Structures are given as C-alpha cells and as structure tokens.
Amino acid sequence: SMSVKKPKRDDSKDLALCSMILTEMETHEDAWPFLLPVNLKLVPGYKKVIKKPMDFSTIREKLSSGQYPNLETFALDVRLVFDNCETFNEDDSDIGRAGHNMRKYFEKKWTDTFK
Numbered sequence: 001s002m003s004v005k006k007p008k009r010d011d012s013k014d015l016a017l018c019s020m021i022l023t024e025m026e027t028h029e030d031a032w033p034f035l036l037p038v039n040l041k042l043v044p045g046y047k048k049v050i051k052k053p054m055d056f057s058t059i060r061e062k063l064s065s066g067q068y069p070n071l072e073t074f075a076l077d078v079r080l081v082f083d084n085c086e087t088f089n090e091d092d093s094d095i096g097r098a099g100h101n102m103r104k105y106f107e108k109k110w111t112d113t114f115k
Contacts, residue, residue, distance in 0.1 A: 021113060059078065
C-alpha cells in the first residue's frame with residue numbers, strides 16, 4: 001500500500017530476456033503457424049471468430065517498440081497466440097498439435113528464466 005513496498009525485484013534484464021525467449025520460439029520447427037498474422041482476407045471465419053489475433057511477428061514489434069509495460073503483459077500475448085490456436089483448430093491436426101507443443105515449450109523457457 002502507500003509507503004509499504006515489497007523488496008524490489010531487478011527488472012532491468014526482462015526486456016532482453018523476453019526477446020531471447022521469443023527468438024527461441026521463432027526458431028522452433030513447429031513455429032510456422034505462428035510466425036506471421038493469419039491472413040484475414042484468405043482464411044474464412046478467422047476475422048469474425050478470433051476477436052484478438054496475435055502472432056510472433058506482432059509480438060516482436062510490440063516488444064521492440066516499448067508496448068509491453070511489464071513481463072506479464074508479454075506472457076499474456078504469447079499465451080493468446082496459443083489460445084487463439086486452440087479456438088480455431090482441432091486438437092487432432094498438425095496446427096493443433098503445433099500449438100500444444102509451442103505452449104509447453106514456452107512455459108518451460110518462462111519458468112526456467114524467471115520462476
């Protein structure tokens with residue numbers, strides 16, 4: 001509360017560390033469904049159904065332009081990519097399985113880097 005603060009966690013490397021994790025996600029072989037925005041002109045249903053589209057390139061732009069106020073807002077966008085994936089794709093599909101793999105891969109990097 002006012003004048004009552006927990007000890008200060010050093011947040012000065014977070015920007016760089018998030019950037020590294022995003023690079024590791026981008027180079028994973030199952031990243032291909034997620035690298036660029038879904039094409040809203042060419043994928044019927046996606047615009048109407050997915051209210052908040054998100055992808056790795058869009059995450060990169062936001063990060064590199066100071067649009068994440070903290071590391072949790074970054075994690076939320078990453079998870080949104082996989083939540084969107086799950087909404088639109090059958091679990092029993094290549095893209096569905098890609099999303100599951102990538103989510104797990106991310107959550108490990110995240111825990112190991114910060115928790």
